[PDB]
């Protein structure tokens, strides 16, 4: 999706995040690690995936501003190693409760609003304004807002569909 301005991007993040996070309210902690064949991840893994990617995007931006060399997706994993990165997200966050994961994700979304407001329009909406954005997709050219959309709005919709499917079968 193309966004015309900062307020449009922030609004869509807020709208899709609120719908996504609300789906976890009715899931008891005792079932946060329950896997079924019909849906890929557990509820805790579903949240951990979002905490994982939002933490990384925020870190790329912070490190680049801090004058560090950003290796994307991370220092330990390459772009053809995402499956292993996802296992690392699960190992690193999924042992948390749903309440703790929701709180952490909410903090990252608030930080993403600050990240957006701290960028100039040019830095947010034009190519080649961040080294980490050029580094994260070397086959194509992606603007910062596109990385934000693809790591918030898009998965907040698709992973919402997963958790709803999971809830209909399990609860």
Author numbering: 13 to 183
Sentences from the paper on this structure:
The precursor PdDfsB is cleaved by subtilisin to yield biologically active Slf, and the chemical gradients of both proteins between two growing colonies could be accurately modelled. However, remarkably, the dfsB gene is widely distributed across Gram-positive and to some extent Gram-negative bacterial kingdoms (PFAM entry DUF1706). PdDfsB adopts a four-helical bundle core structure that belongs to the DinB structural superfamily. The most strongly conserved region of PdDfsB is the C-terminal helix, which is present within the mature Slf sequence.
We were able to express, purify and obtain crystal structures for DfsB homologues from Clostridium difficile 630 and Escherichia coli UTI89, as well as of IRC4 from S. cerevisiae. For the purposes of clarity, we refer to the first two proteins as CdDfsB and EcDfsB, respectively; however, we have no evidence that they are truly acting as DfsB homologues by undergoing cleavage and release of their analogous Slf “toxin”. The overall structures of CdDfsB, EcDfsB and IRC4 are identical with that of PdDfsB, with strong conservation of overall topology and surface charge, particularly in the C-terminal helix. We solved the crystal structure of a S. agalactiae DfsB dimer (SaDfsB) by molecular replacement using a pruned CdDfsB structure as the search model.
